[PDB]
Amino acid sequence: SDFPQHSQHVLEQLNQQRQLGLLCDCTFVVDGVHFKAHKAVLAACSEYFKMLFVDQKDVVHLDISNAAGLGQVLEFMYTAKLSLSPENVDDVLAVATFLQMQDIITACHALKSL
Amino acid sequence: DFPQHSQHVLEQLNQQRQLGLLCDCTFVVDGVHFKAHKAVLAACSEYFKMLFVDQKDVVHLDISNAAGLGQVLEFMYTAKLSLSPENVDDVLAVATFLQMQDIITACHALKSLA
């Protein structure tokens, strides 16, 4: 495979690892929900997570997290897809905002404009 | 020698957690953050013995109160704990959630005095 195919393969393996809860290296506990993930992927997809995990910066802003929003943010990171609904959009928007994730922010505003 | 050696190791672990060095657990609660070592917590907490076993890092956002957590963590690392009617509710909430059985039964013992 060349870079496109080879990269898709790696990310799908990482997504499988996450879904299975195996070969993950970080767990977030929020609102009673445990989310397993890879710090490297989170830092690849969010400047907030990059500076948190690398530079130990702005840790307390994590209390903006909610399960609905973080759930969606993680799905997006690993699959490039969201399932937004009128019910979760504001929660997702709040999380995506502090995570500085523009494509999710845009998707949230896109749904709200309907 | 193990008495002396044990003390030295724990003193160092306490310095590490105050500096936030080599800690793999972050609690965010009441706009405040605490760092700890899961393996140290697992010495007294069944919660940290059983959960997050294969995960390097934990970001925990669900602890109820900062004062009880601070005291529980302080005990883990320095062996210091004072229980009075002032703080017993704070401590018990955390010891319960974290399944630190000895601290739970010490808190219940205190809440029964006329």
Add this chain to the structure above:
Amino acid sequence: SDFPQHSQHVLEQLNQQRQLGLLCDCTFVVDGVHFKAHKAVLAACSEYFKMLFVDQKDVVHLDISNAAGLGQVLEFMYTAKLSLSPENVDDVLAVATFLQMQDIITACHALKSLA
């Protein structure tokens, strides 16, 4: 969906990270030199690593044979880039032989069979 573009970005960032030794949980030391990598990325491409790494956190691995072969194998795992030549094939084979990566092993033998 833009999963193709999205995965390329992710892997670019992962390569950047490992080059800088950021967020890496595997360190190899071989031939007077060290390499950092993410266990989860190596596990995506190698059965040995997938089976070795489960349930482990940080790994310090001191048993890799040669630096040159490992460098190329790790570069491949991140970028898909692999140049096989009579010059480097034995180094790559050695590491592929250690990590029992059969496709690379076979590729190495085919290139060695060039008479």
Add this chain to the structure above:
Amino acid sequence: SDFPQHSQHVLEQLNQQRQLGLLCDCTFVVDGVHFKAHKAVLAACSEYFKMLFVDQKDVVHLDISNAAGLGQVLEFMYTAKLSLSPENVDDVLAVATFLQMQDIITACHALKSL
């Protein structure tokens, strides 16, 4: 229980965790052997390990590790005891040196000579 006692309990638990390996967070693979430990404990007992794990300093230096020696050094860290016999004293010396640990270095020479 007092700090001396509590310290001993904590280290005992950390040593027990090492037996199963699950709650350890660093695995060394050297000469086909896997040794599991806690980075925090290693940093507590060795100046080299501290700098390695915090500051990524002299990563290449690990090249001088061997299975016999690393095993003994790790035993010391967790139990305060060494098991030096003629066959392994040399290996333990080379490992104990670069890790900057005086006790074991002298302990080897106390048996190397007499």
